[PDB]
Amino acid sequence: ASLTEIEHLVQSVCKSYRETCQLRLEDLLRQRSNIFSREEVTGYQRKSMWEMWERCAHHLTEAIQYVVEFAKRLSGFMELCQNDQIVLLKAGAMEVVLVRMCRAYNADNRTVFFEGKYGGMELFRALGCSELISSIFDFSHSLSALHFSEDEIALYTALVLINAHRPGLQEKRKVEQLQYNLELAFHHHLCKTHRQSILAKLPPKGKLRSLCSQHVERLQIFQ
Numbered sequence: 001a002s003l004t005e006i007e008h009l010v011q012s013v014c015k016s017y018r019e020t021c022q023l024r025l026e027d028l029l030r031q032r033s034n035i036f037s038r039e040e041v042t043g044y045q046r047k048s049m050w051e052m053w054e055r056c057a058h059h060l061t062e063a064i065q066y067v068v069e070f071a072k073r074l075s076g077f078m079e080l081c082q083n084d085q086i087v088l089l090k091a092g093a094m095e096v097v098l099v100r101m102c103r104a105y106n107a108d109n110r111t112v113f114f115e116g117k118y119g120g121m122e123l124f125r126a127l128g129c130s131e132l133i134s135s136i137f138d139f140s141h142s143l144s145a146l147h148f149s150e151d152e153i154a155l156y157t158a159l160v161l162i163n164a165h166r167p168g169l170q171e172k173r174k175v176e177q178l179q180y181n182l183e184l185a186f187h188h189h190l191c192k193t194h195r196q197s198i199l200a201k202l203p204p205k206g207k208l209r210s211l212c213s214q215h216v217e218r219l220q221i222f223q
């Protein structure tokens, strides 16, 4: 599986990402100045956990939808069997959602974009999940320091999803072979862009898994 050919793989992945990222980077950057007032924040803090949750769960389900679209446009993903398609999405999707959040986060003032404006962690107080929210803000913050280009995220999240060590896989070797080509592609694009430095700054092995184990833990869905 050759080199001119991983060059096309890099371009292609980067395109799928761009075609499924839901909010454009430009808009997020532009809207940074648009912050929630002291009153608009109080409004959100007054609502019940249940209304926050509805709003949050709808935004998540749309985001997952986009992640699933992204996967479906990566080379070879659609050629894997259905059970394997599912096992990779079930295991990675919310991890990708989480990494995609860092583009909507603003290290200047510890704020994130949500429903048309930018807001600190206190916006989400009726959820009663200060610990979890707070550790999402910290992961988003130490990711914002890498100044991850859009293409690096696309390649990195392609590797979040395409992972042959997910328990449950049945054609492991065909996943391995997609994963390998994607790893080379990321490496090679880092070398083309002089950005090899970022490989050592990326989430320690398992930081993402365990933040997702913790996140998936709220099924407020049950009620």
Ligand SMILES: CC(=O)Nc1cc(-c2ccc(N(C)C(=O)c3c(F)cccc3Cl)c(N3C[C@H]4C[C@H]4C3)c2)n(C(C)C)n1
Pocket (backbone or CB within 6 Å): 053, 055, 056, 057, 059, 060, 063, 097, 101, 112, 113, 114, 115, 116, 121, 124, 127, 129, 132, 133, 136, 137, 218
């Ligand atoms: C336009 C818009 O608002 N989009 C939007 C909003 C959310 C969104 C949707 C849901 C969440 N929250 C709050 C949760 O994922 C969540 C929950 F629903 C229940 C308990 C704990 C958590 Cl973190 C958050 N958080 C978590 C952390 C406070 C920041 C932003 C963010 N998303 C995600 C798909 C990226 N996209």
